[PDB]
A paper describes a structure:
The serine-rich repeat (SRR) adhesins are a family of bacterial cell-surface glycoproteins containing two sequence motifs where serine constitutes ∼50% of the sequence. The binding region from S. sanguinis strain SK1 (residues 252–660 and termed SK1BR) differs from structurally characterized Siglec-containing binding regions in two ways. First, it contains two copies of the Siglec and Unique domains in tandem (SK1Siglec1-SK1Unique1-SK1Siglec2-SK1Unique2) with sequence identity/similarity of 39%/56% between the two Siglec domains and 44%/50% between the two Unique domains. The second way that SK1BR differs from other structurally characterized Siglec-like binding regions is that each of the putative Siglec domains of SK1BR contains a noncanonical YTRY sialic acid–binding sequence motif that lacks the central Thr-Arg deemed to be critical for binding in other Siglec-like adhesins.
The limits of the domains can be clearly distinguished as SK1Siglec1 (residues 252–377), SK1Unique1 (residues 378–453), SK1Siglec2 (residues 454–573), and SK1Unique2 (residues 574–660). As is anticipated from the amino acid sequence conservation, the individual Siglec domains and Unique domains exhibit structural similarity, with RMS deviations in Cα position of 1.058 Å between SK1Siglec1 and SK1Siglec2 and 0.639 Å between SK1Unique1 and SK1Unique2. In the CD loop, this also manifests as a difference in secondary structure in which the CD loop of SK1Siglec1 lacks secondary structure, whereas the CD loop of SK1Siglec2 folds into an α-helix. In addition, the CD loop of SK1Siglec2 is displaced from the binding pocket when compared with the CD loop of SK1Siglec1. Together, these differences in loop length and structure result in a larger and more open binding site as compared with SK1Siglec1.
Numbering used by the authors: 252 to 660
Write the structure that this text describes.
């Protein structure tokens, strides 16, 4: 018969955090494959005692005293579990050594020896020992010695966002200098140093497109996309009317019916190097403005971050261009026969214009005009053509005309 008590396996030490649930399993086996009782108790008391305290240490064994319930491949599982009260002490003496016993169907119970038989030490620790807070991304503030409330709110936001796995009911406070104090549900705390949360914003926004020339073709609507970023990731204002000289050409463009749109200007994190703030200028330089030496508008732009640093005015230009700079006529697919190359007839000119037209649909503007000259060369006149700024192309006669005169003898 069986004279051997079951074998108990369990962790010698379980760290339990105040205000949280804890759980671990005792595993029990026996040669018979059956265990009838599994007990957790305090050391004091008679051999038959199962007295156990405090009331929040709990345990249960679902499958007691059934055959085959306690084998090496499938041991009997005893659940030890509870919730540590929020106000429990967390001194070095706030620990519990509890004794675990098991008894087989033949009545063989494991011996109970103070400080030596099967036991576990449940150690109650503050919630701050479980959690290690992650540094947030830095908040760039006007004055790292005296944070505003919006500064504080932002630091809390970046702490939370970087620490999703802290207890949801944790509370955050930010000092006048940005030092973060995290208070856990049990009142224990953690600190994130001011050096790790904030710095004073010392860098003004950057205009990526400084010095750039944006070409606008006369009579064709165009766009110019200007890009800006800031070390803080955030720009609050973009300004083109810094001084009189810059403000007058800005207002000149607006009077031509241009628009300036910066749709993300009020979004947070709207201005990083990887995802810059974009201002788009849209409009048409009308043909009444000529291209040439003074055919430019020169602008100055400044950008301001949320801490009030404004960049040094930087320059960009819109440069006027004739449409002919953009287009190249295709030559006719065939030449046109002409009886006298020095003076084309009407029907010859009409036939040349048709071939040039057909050769350039989908290439030149639909509203280009062609003049077939007396020598059969062809003047291509773009819609922006004016006397002060001609926009034109010439197709030479050797590409359009073919002499039909017969050869001598
Ligand atoms: Ca046994
Ligand atoms: Ca901690
Ligand atoms: Ca800045
Ligand atoms: Ca051209
Ligand atoms: Mg208008």
């Amino acid at each position: 018969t069986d004279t051997t008590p079951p074998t108990i396996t369990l962790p010698q030490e379980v760290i339990a955090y105040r205000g949280e649930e804890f759980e671990f399993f005792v595993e029990t086996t026996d040669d018979s494959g059956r265990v009838n009782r599994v007990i957790v108790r305090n050391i004091e008391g008679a051999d038959n005692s199962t007295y156990l305290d405090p009331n929040w240490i709990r345990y249960s064994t679902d499958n007691l005293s059934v055959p085959g319930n306690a084998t090496p491949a499938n041991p009997l599982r005893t659940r030890v579990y509870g919730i540590v009260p929020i106000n429990h002490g967390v001194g070095p003496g706030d620990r519990y050594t509890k004794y675990v016993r098991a008894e087989d169907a033949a009545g063989n119970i494991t011996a109970l020896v103070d400080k030596q038989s099967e036991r576990f030490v449940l150690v109650i620790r503050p919630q701050t020992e479980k959690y290690t807070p992650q540094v947030p991304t830095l908040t760039y503030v006007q004055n790292a010695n005296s944070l505003t409330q919006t500064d504080k709110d932002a630091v809390i936001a970046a702490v939370k966002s970087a620490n999703p796995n802290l207890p949801a009911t944790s509370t955050y406070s930010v000092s006048e200098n940005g030092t973060v104090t995290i208070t856990y549900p049990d009142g224990s705390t953690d600190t994130i140093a001011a050096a790790q949360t904030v710095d004073t914003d010392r860098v003004a926004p950057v205009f990526v497109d400084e010095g750039r020339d944006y070409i606008f073709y006369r009579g064709e609507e165009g766009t110019a996309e200007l890009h800006f970023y800031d070390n803080s990731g955030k720009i609050t204002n973009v300004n083109f009317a810094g001084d009189l000289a810059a403000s007058s050409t800005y207002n000149t463009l607006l009077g031509l019916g241009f628009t300036f749109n910066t749709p993300n200007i009020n979004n947070p994190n709207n201005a990083t190097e990887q995802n810059p703030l974009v201002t788009t200028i849209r409009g048409t330089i009308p043909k009444s403005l000529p291209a040439g030496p003074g055919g430019k508008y020169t602008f100055k732009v400044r950008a301001t971050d949320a801490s009030g640093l404004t960049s040094e005015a930087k320059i960009f230009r819109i440069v006027f261009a004739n449409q002919t700079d953009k287009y190249t006529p295709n030559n006719p697919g065939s030449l046109t026969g002409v009886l006298n190359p020095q003076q084309l007839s009407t029907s010859e000119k009409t036939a040349i214009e048709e071939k040039v037209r057909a050769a350039n649909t989908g290439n030149l503007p639909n509203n280009v005009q062609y003049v077939v000259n007396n020598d059969g060369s062809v003047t291509v006149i773009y819609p922006d053509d004016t006397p002060a700024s001609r926009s034109r192309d010439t197709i030479t006669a050797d590409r359009t005309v073919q002499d039909l005169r017969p050869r001598n003898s």
